[PDB]
Amino acid sequence: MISLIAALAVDRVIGMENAMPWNLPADLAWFKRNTLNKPVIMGRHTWESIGRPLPGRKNIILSSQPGTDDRVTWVKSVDEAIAACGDVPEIMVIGGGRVYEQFLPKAQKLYLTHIDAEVEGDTHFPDYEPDDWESVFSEFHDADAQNSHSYCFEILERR
Numbered sequence: 001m002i003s004l005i006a007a008l009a010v011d012r013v014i015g016m017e018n019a020m021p022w023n024l025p026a027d028l029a030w031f032k033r034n035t036l037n038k039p040v041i042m043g044r045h046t047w048e049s050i051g052r053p054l055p056g057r058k059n060i061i062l063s064s065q066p067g068t069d070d071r072v073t074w075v076k077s078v079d080e081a082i083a084a085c086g087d088v089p090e091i092m093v094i095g096g097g098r099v100y101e102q103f104l105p106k107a108q109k110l111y112l113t114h115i116d117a118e119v120e121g122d123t124h125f126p127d128y129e130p131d132d133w134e135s136v137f138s139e140f141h142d143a144d145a146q147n148s149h150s151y152c153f154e155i156l157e158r159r
């Protein structure tokens with residue numbers, strides 16, 4: 001099974017200038033809980049944005065060019081990325097925009113955080129078709145002293 005996990009600001013913005021400008025510790029904690037002990041697939045730009053391997057996960061990087069770091073696994077196509085995960089119950093795709101586009105048609109589950117923040121951005125989560133997806137979990141949180149925007153965690157499953 002393939003799942004995508006992402007955090008979206010208003011208008012599906014996910015990034016600006018190869019960064020995420022907000023800081024929501026509760027959402028990073030949600031990301032860690034839902035990805036720990038699973039393989040994670042990311043594009044090269046997202047690898048450079050994170051800047052280091054994510055511990056406790058098999059890190060698989062898509063790039064058309066040879067890898068430059070043997071602490072992670074480098075692959076050159078979507079099918080190779082999936083194969084490199086082996087026989088696991090759930091593969092997590094962690095972006096960015098170009099990678100989400102390619103894996104969305106293959107995904108059964110979306111883990112989405114909707115953040116109430118207006119962000120100028122240059123990268124968006126793909127338009128997906130709402131009729132294809134059932135919301136199976138949603139949890140709203142108001143802003144607090146640690147998290148400066150309100151946010152909603154949602155899990156959707158392909159119908």
Ligand SMILES: NC(=O)c1ccc[n+]([C@@H]2O[C@H](COP(=O)([O-])OP(=O)(O)OC[C@H]3O[C@@H](n4cnc5c(N)ncnc54)[C@H](OP(=O)(O)O)[C@@H]3O)[C@@H](O)[C@H]2O)c1
Pocket residue numbers: 005006007008013014015016017018019020042043044045046047049062063064065075076077078094095096097098099100102123
């Ligand atoms: N809010 C969130 O949830 C979230 C999550 C992830 C990322 N982001 C943000 O998203 C932005 C990065 O997204 P992006 O769309 O620019 O880049 P990306 O999807 O992270 O990376 C694209 C790169 O991945 C490689 N690639 C993708 N598909 C491939 C394929 N089929 N075969 C081979 N290589 C492939 C290519 O690398 P080469 O050029 O080396 O061939 C391509 O240039 C940043 O702003 C980041 O902060 C946000």
Ligand SMILES: Nc1nc(=O)c2nc(CNc3ccc(C(=O)N[C@@H](CCC(=O)O)C(=O)O)cc3)cnc2[nH]1
Pocket residue numbers: 005006007025027028029030031032046050054055094095112113
């Ligand atoms: N919901 C969601 N939020 C995100 O921030 C997110 N980020 C990415 C890609 N970028 C990043 C950037 C940083 C870390 C990171 O530092 N993660 C630590 C945090 C642990 C914690 O804060 O408790 C990790 O070990 O996962 C992960 C992904 C992909 N999907 C996402 N999905």
Ligand SMILES: [Mn+2]
Pocket residue numbers: 077079
């Ligand atoms: Mn092929």
Ligand SMILES: [Mn+2]
Pocket residue numbers: 086087
């Ligand atoms: Mn197999």
Ligand SMILES: [Mn+2]
Pocket residue numbers: 116117118148149150
């Ligand atoms: Mn806000």
